[PDB]
Ligand binder design. Structure first.
Ligand SMILES: CC(=O)c1ccc(-c2sc(NC(=O)NCCC(=O)NC(C)(C)C)nc2C)cc1
Length: 801
C-alpha cells in the first residue's frame, strides 16, 4: 500500500534497507526498530510545535567579555524590514516586537531560515552573538510564524563455557589457527586456541574449546571474539554471548568474518560481513572503618592521574577495596569501573549495589570529559554507560550540537543496537531541528561507508526519520537528490581529466543540463538555502583530485547581499577525518570562550557523504599562503604586501594584522595539541581580512607553522609578536585545563576515524605537558615557538620534491 511507498522513501533517504534480513543471525535490529517506537512518539507528542517549527538557536551561557567590549553603549541595534531600533541586551523578542508596534508576527533572520523567538534575551541568541563577534548588523524581517501543521508526523549453571569450532571456509587465497576470546569492554577474561592446521579453502576442527569461566559468570555485553591467525591476524568476527533478551546464546552459527588491512572501532562490531561471496566464514556451535592517611594519599594520587595513565594491579586492588571511598570523587569513576572483574558474577553484583547509592555522582556538576570516558570502548556494562548518558541528559541543545558528532561516533562502542545513548540522540534530534539535521547527516555519512556499523546507524536513522516530520522529510529528500546529482558530476569530470578545454566545456555543459532541484538546504549550514547554479562561476579546481568548484544563488529573496554560496565537491579525500578535526576545533573554540578568549578559528563546514567523497564550504575572500608567495616570486615580505594590497584603509590593514595574530596563535596552539602543526604552506589559507586557517586535514621537522613570512607580518622582537607569544600561552594553558576531555576526544577520534595503537594517542598527552606546572608548560610552548623560528623555511622548501 501507500504505507509501503513511505518505507521505500525512507530507504531512499537512508541509503540502506532496514527491512532487509539478509545479514542477520538474530532479530536484534528489528527488536531495536520496535523498541525505538516508544521514545520516538514520546518525544514527538511532548515537543512544542511552535518552538519546534521555528527552532530558535539559543544558549544559556553568559555573553563573553570580548563581546561586551563591542557594545559600549548597552544598545544593540536591530534593523527591521525598514528602520533601526535601539534595544537592550536583555530585551526579549516579545518585548522587542511589542515595543516596535507601540501582534502575532515574528522576527526571522534576513536570508535565512532562522528565528529569534522564545523567552530568551537577544543577548542569548547565537545569530546575534555571531553578528556581534563579526561586527555585522542584525537584520530581520517581520514574517508570519511557520505553520506547525507542517511538522505533522505520519502516525505509526556452574558448567564452564564451551564453544564448538567446526571450521573455516574461504574460496580465496602457510598455517592457520583459531583464537576464541571472551571480551568485555576490550578486557579479555579468558582465551583459548585451536591446533595449527594447513591453511586451505576448508579447515575443519570439530573441536570443543573449554574456557576457564563459568556460565553464570558471563556478564551482559560480553563478546565471543573469534579470530584467525596465519604469526599474523587475518580475520575477525564477534558474537554477543548474551543477546538483547538476556538469553544465553545457543545454536549453530555461520559467521562471515571481516578481513584485516596491512585497536579501532570496527574490530568491535557485532555485525558480520555482508559480502558472503568472497568473505571468510567461521562455523561454530553453542550448547549450554575508614582509610589511613598514606593509603588515602596513594588513592587520591591514583584518581588524580590522566585517562591514559594505565592502572596497575595494586592500583585496581586499592580502588576496589576502597570503592565506597572512591565513589565520593566523580573523577575516579572511569578508573573505578575499570578495576572491576567483570568475569565474576558476585563482583558485578557488588558493583551494581555500589551504583545503587550514587548521590555524589548525581549531584556532581556535568563533566563532559568524564562522561566521554564512560561512553568509550573500555566500558561494556550498560549501567556504567547509562550513568554517563544520564549526565549527558542535562546538556542544553547548544552543547549537544557541540558534541553531536562524537556522541554519534561513540554509538559504535555500544554493545547492543538499542542503547541509552542511541535513545538519547533520538530524543535530542527529534526535540530540535538543528540537532536533527546534523544527526541525519552524521548517521548518513557512517551508513554510506561503514559496513561494520551501517545496520545499527540505519536503524537509528529510520527511527529518527519516522518522527522528524513531513516537512523535514521533504528537506532531506531534496538535499539527498542534489548531492547525488553533484557527486555523479564530480566522478565523471574526475574520470575525464592540469585542466583541459574539453574539461571546462564538459563541466559547464553538464551543469547546464543538470539544472533542467529548485532549491535545497545547505547540508553544512542548515540555515542557508541554495537555489539556481551560477554556472559561469563553476569550474574544476585543477587539484590532483579534480574537485568541483560550484557556486549557487541564495534562494531567499529576503537575503540582503548578492554573494553566492560556494561549495567544493571532492572525491579522493576521506572527509570523515576532516569532520572530526573541525568539530574538535569548534570544541577548542568553546573551551577558549569559557575563559573570554577568541582566537578567531575558521572551522569551515564540511560533510562526508560517501566513501572518500564529500562537500566543503567556501569561506569568503580567502587564498593560500603558498599562492601569495608564488604570485610575487621564499620571500618573507610578501604576506604583508598582499595584506596592504587587499585592505583599502590603513585602519582595515591594522585590523587585519590583529585578526591575523589572533587566528595564527589559535591555529598554532590547536595544530600543536592535535599533532597536525607541521603543514605545507599550500594547506594554510588566509582571508582578505587577515584571518588565517588550515585546510584539508585528511590523511594527515617542526612543531607547527610560524614561518618568517608570518613573523614579518608580525615584525621581527616586536610589540605584536609579544601579543602573539602571550595569546599562545594563554590558550595553551586554557586547553591544558581541559586536558582530560581533549585526550578522551583525541583517542575516540583515532579509534573511530583513523586507520591506531597505543603509541599514537600519547602524543596529545605529551603535547599537553601532562603532570607539569603551568609555568613550565608556558616555557615549553615558548621553546616550540623558538624552534619554529630557528627552522625557517627548511621544511617548507624540502616538501617541494
Ligand atoms: C584542497 C581542498 O579540498 C579545499 C581547498 C580550499 C577550500 C576552501 S576555499 C574557501 N574560501 C574561498 O575560496 N573564498 C573565495 C571565493 C568566494 O568568493 N566564495 C563565495 C562566492 C563567497 C562563496 N574556504 C575553504 C575551506 C576547501 C577545500
Amino acid at each position: 500500500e501507500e504505507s509501503q511507498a513511505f518505507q521505500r522513501q525512507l530507504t531512499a533517504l537512508i541509503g540502506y534497507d532496514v527491512t532487509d534480513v539478509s545479514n542477520v543471525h538474530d532479530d536484534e535490529l528489528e527488536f531495536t526498530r520496535r523498541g525505538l517506537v516508544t521514545p520516538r512518539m514520546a518525544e514527538v507528542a511532548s515537543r512544542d510545535p511552535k518552538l519546534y517549527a521555528m527552532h530558535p538557536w539559543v544558549t544559556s551561557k553568559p555573553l563573553p567579555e570580548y563581546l561586551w567590549k563591542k557594545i559600549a553603549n548597552n544598545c544593540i541595534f536591530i534593523v527591521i524590514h525598514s528602520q533601526t531600533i535601539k534595544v537592550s541586551p536583555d530585551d526579549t523578542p516579545g518585548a522587542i516586537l511589542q515595543s516596535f508596534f507601540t501582534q502575532d508576527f515574528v522576527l526571522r533572520v534576513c536570508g535565512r531560515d532562522e528565528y529569534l523567538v522564545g523567552e530568551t534575551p537577544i543577548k542569548n541568541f547565537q545569530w546575534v552573538r555571531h553578528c556581534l563577534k563579526n561586527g555585522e548588523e542584525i537584520h530581520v524581517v517581520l514574517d508570519t510564524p511557520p505553520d506547525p501543521a507542517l511538522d505533522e508526523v505520519r502516525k505509526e549453571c556452574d558448567r564452564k563455557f564451551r564453544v564448538k569450532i567446526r571450521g573455516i571456509d574461504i574460496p580465496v587465497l602457510l598455517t592457520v589457527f583459531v583464537e576464541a576470546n571472551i571480551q568485555h569492554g576490550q578486557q579479555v577474561l579468558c582465551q583459548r586456541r585451536t591446533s595449527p592446521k594447513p591453511f586451505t579453502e576448508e579447515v575443519l576442527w570439530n573441536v570443543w574449546l573449554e574456557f576457564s569461566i563459568k556460565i553464570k559468570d558471563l556478564p551482559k555485553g560480553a563478546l565471543l571474539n573469534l579470530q584467525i591467525y596465519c604469526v599474523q591476524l587475518l580475520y575477525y568476527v564477534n558474537l554477543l554471548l548474551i543477546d538483547h533478551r538476556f538469553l544465553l546464546r545457543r545454536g549453530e552459527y555461520v559467521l562471515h568474518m571481516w578481513q584485516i588491512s596491512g585497536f579501532n572501532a570496527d574490530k568491535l562490531t557485532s555485525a558480520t560481513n555482508p559480502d558472503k561471496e568472497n568473505s571468510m566464514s567461521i562455523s561454530i556451535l553453542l550448547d549450554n572503618a575508614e582509610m589511613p592517611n598514606q593509603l588515602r594519599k596513594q588513592l587520591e594520587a591514583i584518581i588524580a592521574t590522566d585517562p591514559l595513565n594505565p592502572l596497575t594491579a595494586e592500583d585496581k586492588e586499592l580502588l576496589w577495596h576502597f570503592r565506597y571511598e572512591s565513589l565520593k570523587h566523580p573523577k575516579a569513576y572511569p578508573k573505578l569501573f575499570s578495576s572491576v572483574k567483570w568475569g565474576q558474577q558476585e563482583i558485578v553484583a557488588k558493583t551494581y549495589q555500589l551504583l545503587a547509592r550514587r548521590e555524589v555522582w548525581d549531584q556532581s556538576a556535568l563533566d563532559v570529559g568524564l562522561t566521554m570516558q564512560l561512553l568509550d570502548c573500555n566500558f561494556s556494562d550498560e549501567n556504567v554507560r547509562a550513568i554517563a548518558v544520564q549526565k549527558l541528559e542535562s546538556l542544553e541543545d547548544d552543547d549537544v550540537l557541540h558534541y553531536l558528532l562524537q556522541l554519534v561516533q561513540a554509538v559504535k562502542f555500544e554493545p547492543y543496537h538499542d542503547s541509552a545513548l542511541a535513545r538519547f540522540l533520538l530524543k535530542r534530534g527529534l526535540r530540535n531541528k538543528r540537532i536533527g539535521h546534523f544527526l541525519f547527516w552524521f548517521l548518513r555519512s557512517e551508513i554510506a561507508q561503514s559496513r561494520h556499523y551501517q545496520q545499527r546507524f540505519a536503524v537509528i536513522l529510520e527511527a529518527y526519520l519516522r518522527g522528524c516530520g513531513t516537512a523535514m522529510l521533504h528537506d532531506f529528500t531534496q538535499q539527498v537528490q542534489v548531492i547525488e546529482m553533484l557527486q555523479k558530476v564530480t566522478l565523471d569530470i574526475k574520470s575525464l581529466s592540469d585542466v583541459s578545454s574539453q574539461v571546462i566545456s564538459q563541466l559547464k555543459q553538464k551543469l547546464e543540463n543538470l539544472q533542467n532541484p529548485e532549491s535545497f538546504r545547505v547540508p553544512y549550514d542548515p540555515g542557508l538555502k541554495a537555489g539556481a547554479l551560477a554556472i559561469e562561476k563553476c569550474k574544476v579546481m585543477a587539484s590532483k583530485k579534480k574537485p568541483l568548484w560550484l557556486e549557487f544563488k541564495c534562494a531567499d529573496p529576503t537575503a540582503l547581499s548578492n554573494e553566492t554560496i560556494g561549495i567544493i565537491f571532492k572525491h579522493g579525500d576521506d572527509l570523515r577525518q576532516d569532520m572530526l578535526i573541525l568539530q574538535i576545533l569548534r570544541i577548542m573554540e568553546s573551551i577558549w570562550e569559557t575563559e573570554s578568549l577568541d582566537l578567531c578559528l575558521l572551522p569551515y563546514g564540511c560533510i562526508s557523504t560517501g566513501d572518500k567523497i564529500g562537500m566543503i564550504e567556501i569561506v569568503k575572500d580567502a587564498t593560500t599562503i603558498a599562492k601569495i608567495q608564488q604570485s610575487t616570486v621564499f620571500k618573507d615580505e610578501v604576506l604583508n604586501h598582499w595584506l596592504k594590497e587587499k585592505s583599502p584603509t590603513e585602519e582595515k590593514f591594522q585590523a587585519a594584522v590583529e585578526r591575523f595574530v589572533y587566528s595564527c596563535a589559535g591555529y598554532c596552539v590547536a595544530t600543536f595539541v592535535l599533532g597536525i602543526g607541521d603543514r605545507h604552506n599550500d594547506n594554510i589559507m588566509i582571508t582578505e581580512t587577515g584571518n588565517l586557517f588550515h585546510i584539508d586535514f585528511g590523511h594527515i621537522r617542526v612543531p607547527f607553522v610560524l614561518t618568517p613570512d608570518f613573523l614579518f607580518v608580525m615584525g621581527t622582537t616586536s610589540p605584536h609578536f609579544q601579543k602573539f607569544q602571550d595569546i599562545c600561552v594563554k590558550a595553551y594553558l586554557a586547553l591544558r585545563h581541559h586536558t582530560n576531555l581533549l585526550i578522551i576526544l583525541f583517542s575516540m577520534m583515532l579509534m573511530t576515524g583513523m586507520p591506531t595503537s597505543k603509541e599514537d594517542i600519547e602524543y596529545i598527552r605529551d603535547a599537553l605537558t601532562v603532570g607539569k606546572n603551568e609555568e613550565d608548560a608556558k616555557k615549553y610552548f615558548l621553546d616550540q615557538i623558538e624552534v619554529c623560528r630557528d627552522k625557517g623555511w627548511t621544511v617548507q622548501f624540502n616538501w617541494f620534491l
